[PDB]
Amino acid sequence: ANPLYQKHIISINDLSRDDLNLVLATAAKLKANPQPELLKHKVIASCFFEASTRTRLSFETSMHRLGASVVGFSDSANTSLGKKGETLADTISVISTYVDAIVMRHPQEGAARLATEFSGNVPVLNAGDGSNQHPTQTLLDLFTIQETQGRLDNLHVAMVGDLKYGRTVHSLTQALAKFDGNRFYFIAPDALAMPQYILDMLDEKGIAWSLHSSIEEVMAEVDILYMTRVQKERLDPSEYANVKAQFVLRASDLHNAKANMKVLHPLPRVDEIATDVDKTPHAWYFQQAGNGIFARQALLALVLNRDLVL
Amino acid sequence: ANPLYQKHIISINDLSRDDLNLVLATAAKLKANPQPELLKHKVIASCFFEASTRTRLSFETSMHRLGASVVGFSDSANTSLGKKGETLADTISVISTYVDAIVMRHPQEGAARLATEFSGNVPVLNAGDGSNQHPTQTLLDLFTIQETQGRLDNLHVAMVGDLKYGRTVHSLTQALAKFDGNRFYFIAPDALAMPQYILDMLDEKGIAWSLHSSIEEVMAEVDILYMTRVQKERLDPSEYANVKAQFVLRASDLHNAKANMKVLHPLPRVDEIATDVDKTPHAWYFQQAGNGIFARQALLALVLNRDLVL
Amino acid sequence: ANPLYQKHIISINDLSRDDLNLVLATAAKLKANPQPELLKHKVIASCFFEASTRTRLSFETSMHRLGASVVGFSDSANTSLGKKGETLADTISVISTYVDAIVMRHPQEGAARLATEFSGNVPVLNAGDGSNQHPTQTLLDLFTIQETQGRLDNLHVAMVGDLKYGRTVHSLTQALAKFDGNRFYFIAPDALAMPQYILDMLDEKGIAWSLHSSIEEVMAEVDILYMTRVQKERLDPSEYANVKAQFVLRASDLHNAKANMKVLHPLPRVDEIATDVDKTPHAWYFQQAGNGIFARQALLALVLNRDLVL
Amino acid sequence: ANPLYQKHIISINDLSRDDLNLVLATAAKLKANPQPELLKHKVIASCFFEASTRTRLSFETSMHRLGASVVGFSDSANTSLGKKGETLADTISVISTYVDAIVMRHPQEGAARLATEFSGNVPVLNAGDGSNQHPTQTLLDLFTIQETQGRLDNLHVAMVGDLKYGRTVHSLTQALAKFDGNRFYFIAPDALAMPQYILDMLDEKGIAWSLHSSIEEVMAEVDILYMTRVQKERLDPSEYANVKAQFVLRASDLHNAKANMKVLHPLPRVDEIATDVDKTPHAWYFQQAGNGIFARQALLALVLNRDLVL
Amino acid sequence: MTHDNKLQVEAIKRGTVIDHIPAQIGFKLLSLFKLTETDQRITIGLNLPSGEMGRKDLIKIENTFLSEDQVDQLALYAPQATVNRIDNYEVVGKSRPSLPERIDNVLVCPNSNCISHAEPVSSSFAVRKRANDIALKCKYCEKEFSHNVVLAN
Amino acid sequence: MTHDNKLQVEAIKRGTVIDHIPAQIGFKLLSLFKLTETDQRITIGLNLPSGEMGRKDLIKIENTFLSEDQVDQLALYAPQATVNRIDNYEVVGKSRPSLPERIDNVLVCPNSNCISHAEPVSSSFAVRKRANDIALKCKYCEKEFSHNVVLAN
Numbered sequence A, B, C, D: 001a002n003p004l005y006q007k008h009i010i011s012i013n014d015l016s017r018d019d020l021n022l023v024l025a026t027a028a029k030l031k032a033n034p035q036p037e038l039l040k041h042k043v044i045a046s047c048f049f050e051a052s053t054r055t056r057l058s059f060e061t062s063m064h065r066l067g068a069s070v071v072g073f074s075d076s077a078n079t080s081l082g083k084k085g086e087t088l089a090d091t092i093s094v095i096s097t098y099v100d101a102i103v104m105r106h107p108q109e110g111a112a113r114l115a116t117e118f119s120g121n122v123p124v125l126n127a128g129d130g131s132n133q134h135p136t137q138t139l140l141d142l143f144t145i146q147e148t149q150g151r152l153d154n155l156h157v158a159m160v161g162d163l164k165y166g167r168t169v170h171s172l173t174q175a176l177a178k179f180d181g182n183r184f185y186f187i188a189p190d191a192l193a194m195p196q197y198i199l200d201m202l203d204e205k206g207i208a209w210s211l212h213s214s215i216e217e218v219m220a221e222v223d224i225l226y227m228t229r230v231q232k233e234r235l236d237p238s239e240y241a242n243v244k245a246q247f248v249l250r251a252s253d254l255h256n257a258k259a260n261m262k263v264l265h266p267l268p269r270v271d272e273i274a275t276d277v278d279k280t281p282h283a284w285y286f287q288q289a290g291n292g293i294f295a296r297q298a299l300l301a302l303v304l305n306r307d308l309v310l
Numbered sequence E, F: 001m002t003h004d005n006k007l008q009v010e011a012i013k014r015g016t017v018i019d020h021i022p023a024q025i026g027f028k029l030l031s032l033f034k035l036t037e038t039d040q041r042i043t044i045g046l047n048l049p050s051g052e053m054g055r056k057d058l059i060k061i062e063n064t065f066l067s068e069d070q071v072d073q074l075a076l077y078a079p080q081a082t083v084n085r086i087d088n089y090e091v092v093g094k095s096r097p098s099l100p101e102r103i104d105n106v107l108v109c110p111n112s113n114c115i116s117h118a119e120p121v122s123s124s125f126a127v128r129k130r131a132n133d134i135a136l137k138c139k140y141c142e143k144e145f146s147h148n149v150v151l152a153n
């Protein structure tokens, strides 16, 4: 039986390097020969207690491309659950009574892991729990670095933007640290700096990182440039606009990028990457979003299947 | 052709004992050998004009487990139907023009029965009409009494909670009265008493019932203890809390319950059943919710199929 | 100073028969010989944390017919104080440094009493606190009973409607049970009847009361008919429409009433009192609302002025 | 006429030390010997396009303790002006034909200053404009520092909380840097520290300041402790709960304070100041809110009266 | 200084001894009435072998004399108790609790719309009807409940 | 005999004596670890003179052997407490608390958005002596806090 068979994919810190490579080699196969009836007759719940369209449409299309049925709700817009005083432990003890896996997003951190205590042995795959984790966004990012760069070690990866609150830059830094010889460049305004616990974990593993104030200091050396959106609510109108709005990429900045350099962005991009970057061969944010189909398909295949023959 | 073929399941008072037993023997078969393509190519509408997540997810998963497609809406959150001044007669005359059955919940009593006048011969299955009926919740309850108790007659059934407004205790009392020798114990605060029309119908059928003020008066004799939630809105804050909040079950109260006694609750339970009851072998509320899958599957199978070979 | 000078007016329970008589005596003087500059230079705060337009406007008009200034607010989905974190105690502690008296209506019971512990020596007058007290309504009903009947003792007072939850009828019975010889008739749907506490108190004082079923039964003996509205939230629509052929009042029903009998209603009178009653001599609910002005002017004048010579 | 007669009060930056002293001198006279008919026959407009209940009520009470009339509004999801298309400039141009002075609070910065160009010769007083200015708060804090300490120079003023975004602390530092010899201690989470502009200004004047980490460090030297609230929106809940063991004030911490040391807070004080501080002699935030009345009466009297002889 | 043992532990030099505490109410009493925040020596016996209830509990607080109103707050939880007051190794005083007229701080109004839940006030209840069974009226919301119910929560 | 030390000693036959409880942690320990929910004889001593470590507390629990894990748990509160088992009238093992792997149940997540606040869950933190302090990682939100942020709250 494969190691992920019937496991819960709650956190990236729980997946080993080997776990990461198994998912990523399976995504590569399903991208190459489809298996559109592997999950035939499986019914899966797509519970998004917090709405997230991008993520839901992708998760469900991946479920549809392997043949599974989907039931569920998008909410944050009062669709009857939580009324009276139904606890989440009780909602999950009733939903796992008839579905084969629960994909769930929720506003509080820890909610997917508590679902795990109540689901019996229906697996729980986490699609975001507050500011804690989002495994399936790190899995697709990793798959896109792997697929375009050919490797996940010896990378020079730059992380640009709000590094203090960006839930995905924090997990991708944790996963790339599972691998060897990667080098990090963090470029963030001072108020949005990469927290100590990341930095401390990097230092303790002997991994090299450095902070820079502009992208042009490091463009030449870089392989993956992972951009984040600054949320203007996190600053005041004037701070955002003042000098700090220069974590924005334009096509002209790519002048001297290596032929292999790729720009990734979990999205929505609002203005940190200008529209003219799209026509460059380095723009890979949308092809990154398309790769979420195969990484989410691979996890569902590996978790619901004992033995996966390919 | 089976008796339920292409009938509307609007009310429990319209189903005979034989009708009830046929559905329940079919639920038992589908629970035992699945028939995941019996409703292949059927498209069913899941119209929940009033949102009810628990009920919708269950109805749709049952539709998915027999192979049917589902289209439809959850609303009570202004999703365009009822705008301009579209009557329900007109909404249903247009939806029955392309679906094979309508499952519908609605806030006013009588709405499913009016849908029946306009659907042509697309069957209408009612998932709740205001304070009137909910057949599919009584069917699953009955199936869970049958399956755990081995029978539906000669039962000592206690009904605890708000018996005046609880739509489901009223219908389950009506269905169990279809059968023989059952004995009822009603335990309700005075303002939430079981209405006369129930009591009068019981008296007229020679069925025995009695009112008690605590569960410990009757625990020893009881087979099914069906708990209801008191809605605090139905009382004032102080009334609810005052003496009347003792229609709450804890594990310690089960001390002398018969080995067969089962606790059922349509849900959400908020605090009338304490968390420690769950670890007792008598807690059957969630296994009751899981049984809604087979009772709803059986009705859909029986209504859309001429002859059901098993 | 007068007995109520700088006193807090929170519960009718807290004021003796003599205080009640002092108020009703003053209100008759203020109705007779107006004193428009009595509170000249006082600023009263009208803090309605719960919107009530008729009670707010009667009070601000009282404030202004005695010459005072008014600062305040009302609140449905608006106006910052309370918010969350802002305690009522810190709102009061701050507002009691600005004003000379506080009139407040709030949704939780005892809000006016909590206020009293933070206003300093600024008097706090309760205009409604959840389901507990509303003394300025009881004072205007008593003024209206006194000026129509000539006394407050030896009355045959019929109370009708939701006796279980009308806060005004609980108060009125307490207050009229401080005068002597009053006989009480309580015509309620038994789902909505007098709490046993009102009834238990009335028996310790020896007061006579009786429960009746329809006004037609007591019409002939009664001096005040105090109608209350029936809260259709607290009732099932089908129960609501079922009770006898209601307890609504029409002029046909009055063909029997005593010449000096008056119908009172705290208002709104939605459908329990038909429009034809409005033109009989027995209709007194609008004159009852006009006396609100004289009752609240009396209370304000006594609280804020040491000696009042009128 | 007096220096401020018919002047606009928009930024604290715009008023010299002498103007600040003129106001604080007048407010002490108005507190001493009231003048209730000073603005008799003036109508002031209280235009709160942003709801602020404590600031609105302090101002309207100021207006009324000097005899003026008040027309105005507040606005959460209500009240037509602005709407869209209605420019602030045309609202002002219209309202300045009706009133004698305009007090306004608005969410965008410089709204009060734009107003000044359309009010004609009608004075405009700012009660808050986005994150820019709130001069009537600074004037009441200074009045409170002057009446508790006896001077406005040579003070050891500790400022605590969100120094980066409290508009009141930016203003207070500007204003206290017009008096002489003041020493400043700034205890902020470094994510929320004094902007370099306040700090750059303080150094051009030679003022001494220092940054500290916890109040326990400066407790012993300090005359004013000005606490500010920490905006938990601007913070991750987990960061918010992580900082040292907070910068909240409890009476245990005050065991060291100077006898004349006072704790000020613009309010609300949600949890940064515990309830036991309220009973120490060092608590002065409610007396600080009462002085709001005297500060805004002084400003209104000087703006609307040519010569004031009190 | 006298022959302690622990089955009925002996002698403090002056202080209070609340003895004949029902059983499992002794710790309830240390919690509720915060008896613990003194730097004085407290000695406590729990599930002890005698004072006729069979098992009983006992608290000894040297140098503290807590009295008359304090002794009466003990009445809803431990009405069978005796509060011995001691000076120079002798029980110079021995009283029992009796129902007070007011019980501050210790109870929670069972009415959830009461304002006392969210605010910097102490709970307060007016007490009435000795031993046939106690009703408690909240100071704030003025709802009267059965002690049974407030004492449940 | 006397330089007072014991006086008429509560010398138990079989049990656990938790000695050197740092003063004021004595009551925490009973509450948090729900040690009085037993029918066996306990004798507690609060704020004992122990000139030798100033003042301390001490719980004696009869016929109970609370151990290994149960003992290590106390490490966060009373870092130096010597638990002592007794089998027949004397010390048959003094055991010191070691900092454990996990601390379950007794502790609260600082994180107000952590789901453990509204749910039927028992808290659980992973302990890491980050040499200087002890960091505590929540099982659910996976946020890491100084043990002093958690032990205040």
Ligand SMILES: Nc1ccn([C@@H]2O[C@H](COP(=O)(O)OP(=O)(O)OP(=O)(O)O)[C@@H](O)[C@H]2O)c(=O)n1
Pocket (backbone or CB within 6 Å): E008, E009, E010, E011, E012, E013, E014, E017, E019, E060, E082, E084, E086, E088, E089, E090, E091, E094
């Ligand atoms: N200096 C002393 C003297 C007495 N006691 C305690 O005081 C309590 C009761 O005092 P006493 O009247 O001397 O014994 P009793 O007569 O049994 O009191 P009662 O009849 O009320 O039980 C006993 O539990 C005893 O331990 C004590 O601790 N210290």
Ligand SMILES: Nc1ccn([C@@H]2O[C@H](COP(=O)(O)OP(=O)(O)OP(=O)(O)O)[C@@H](O)[C@H]2O)c(=O)n1
Pocket (backbone or CB within 6 Å): F010, F011, F012, F013, F017, F019, F060, F082, F084, F086, F089, F090, F091, F094
């Ligand atoms: N029959 C016994 C034996 C011991 N003890 C208790 O067990 C503890 C064990 O201490 P011990 O090793 O006997 O001498 P100490 O020096 O007090 O131990 P430590 O060095 O840890 O303080 C003492 O507090 C004593 O009260 C007891 O109550 N009954």
Ligand SMILES: [Zn+2]
Pocket (backbone or CB within 6 Å): C110, E109, E110, E111, E114, E115, E116, E138, E139, E140, E141, E142, E143
């Ligand atoms: Zn209360």
Ligand SMILES: [Zn+2]
Pocket (backbone or CB within 6 Å): A110, F109, F110, F111, F114, F115, F116, F138, F139, F140, F141, F142, F143
């Ligand atoms: Zn947590």
